[PDB]
Design a protein around this ligand. Sequence first.
Ligand SMILES: O=C(NCc1ccc(NS(=O)(=O)C2CC2)cc1C(F)(F)F)c1ccc2c(ccn2Cc2cccc(F)c2)c1
Length: 257
Amino acid sequence: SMQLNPESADLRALAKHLYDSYIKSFPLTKAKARAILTGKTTDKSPFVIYDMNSLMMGESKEVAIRIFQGCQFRSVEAVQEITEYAKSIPGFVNLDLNDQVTLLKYGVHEIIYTMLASLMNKDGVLISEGQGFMTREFLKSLRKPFGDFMEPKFEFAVKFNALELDDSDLAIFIAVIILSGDRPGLLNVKPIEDIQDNLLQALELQLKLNHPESSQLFAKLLQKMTDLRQIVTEHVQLLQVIKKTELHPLLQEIYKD
Ligand SMILES: O=C(NCc1ccc(NS(=O)(=O)C2CC2)cc1C(F)(F)F)c1ccc2c(ccn2Cc2cccc(F)c2)c1
């Protein structure tokens, strides 16, 4: 932040641009989520699924299957949302279409887990764009091996939510994730890394401006990009299981290779 000059003003314009398209691409923001989770919102208070009884009034193996079929459904519409946003990242549509598909191939699950944290508190998660709330302990209590399917998310979210990012912060963060230069099968790492470096400059200036009394928030955020890789691997391992135990075409395209 040290200087107010043309370079720092471009980085603010890039942050504004990302925020606006974020707001356009993501109906349920962290600000709206935090409002629903605190009772303040105008929107009719969401129904709380906390046991088998409350799940029935909301709508065993059938209870589990149904829940995971919604998570597959919402995850598909979540990929649409994130596709829209990526298109708004200055530069992104000027890379080999192959690289674009790649960057998004490996990106969506990391963003999903990132933005899922926005919908979470200690007690549980907002579902169906804020109309429901499903508790951590209920999800936990589901038949093995689906029973332990969100716990990693809740664990991630607890530590992620303690950073106290807002929508402005997350917009740039989410862009930094999509423009990851280490994804398999990238043709041109240079142009990708080049955009990410500018995004990383915009994030840093954003975190300095937005979190005055917040030590190494930049470093801690970049370390979260490490937690996310690990979480995505552990999901895949869990689905490598369901294959033998018990997805959606576009999720199958992403899980392949
Ligand atoms: O928003 C949902 N889930 C978000 C989500 C996304 C991904 C995941 N994890 S994942 O899939 O592993 C990710 C990598 C791709 C988990 C969730 C979670 F539920 F935990 F929050 C949601 C939940 C229930 C829904 C539906 C749709 C139908 N059900 C039933 C119903 C329950 C209550 C009322 C009702 F009308 C339907 C959608």
